[PDB]
């Protein structure tokens, strides 16, 4: 009922590639153990970075930066988290020794946030940056972090990005070693 | 080879101070996150301090205000200054990247003991 508007925020959506095929090929107990280990790592990483996980929807995972506490480096902070996230997914092997490939989408812009007290994920975030971020994950290529121009312009001096081959998007490659 | 060797541990009495170092070789510190963890035994390694590549720091509630994590990119090393040490802080301390933590690749760590000797 109570909605709060944030002018600046950055939103991440992460989604497992091929999880239907994984879930159909894995015993239910081992699938639960795999997902719990992956999400326990993700949850730890979120609090380590001081961010907030807003929604976990099956094999989807939504993280916000700048809400409820605004920070001037909200886009840069989410980018460092996203790179840690994909590296965690790359190093975390199932009992078969295969990584769990992700699609990750990042966006920045205004959001609205509110408390829905009767829910588990009782703090909801919606709005422009959430809608763009979901688009970025939706159309992402396997294993990449896809971002729009507005994110690119905020990361380009500290991070390496490559333009994806009307809307132009970019792949977040990693942190610059030196400027 | 990719390794992380901790050092700086030892014996201190309550209220004392220690400075732990974590030297990294095989990775470039400036593009990686680094965290410090402790294993008492009543649990597995819990994280107490975390430093991102942009310089953000966060700490566990139990140690915040008393511990400070910091970086030295030239030496490719991360530090944990420990102040106002308590018996509850006695543990083996390790450093690790997020990838090393989920990968289970740990160094041998450094012992920190808080008592009277
Ligand atoms: C064996 N697993 C299940 C058992 C019972 C109920 C659901 C599932 C299950 O696997 O749910 C997941 C799919 O099978 C479930 N699902 C798949 N097909 C169907 C389907 O035909 N009906 C229903 N109800 N659910 C389905 O959606 C979920 C994954 O959606 P994504 O969009 O993330 O797809 P993805 O496989 O990750 O591919 P991508 O991300 O790489 O694009
Ligand atoms: Mn998926
Ligand atoms: Mn869980
Ligand atoms: Mn999904």
Residue numbers in the entry:
A (entry chain A): 46 to 210, 219 to 232
B (entry chain B): 6 to 122
Reproduce text from the manuscript describing this model:
One of these reagents, nanobody 4 (NB4), had no effect on the catalytic activity of the full-length cyclase, but had a nanomolar affinity for the SOL domain. To visualize the details of the Cya–NB4 interaction, we crystallized the SOL construct in the presence of NB4 and solved the X-ray structure of the complex at 2.1 Å resolution. The structure showed an extensive interaction interface between the negatively charged surface of the monomeric SOL domain and the NB4. Interestingly, the crystallized construct did not form a native-like dimeric form of the enzyme, but nevertheless retained the ability to bind to MANT-GTP/Mn2+, with an unusual twist of the MANT-GTP base. (D) Despite retaining the ability to bind the MANT-GTP molecule via one-half of its catalytic site, the position of the nucleotide is distinct from that observed in the structure of the nucleotide-bound dimeric Cya. The lack of the TM region results in failure to form a stable active dimer of M. tuberculosis Rv1625c/Cya, even in the presence of a nucleotide analogue MANT-GTP, judged by the inability of MANT-GTP to induce crystallization of the protein in a dimeric form.
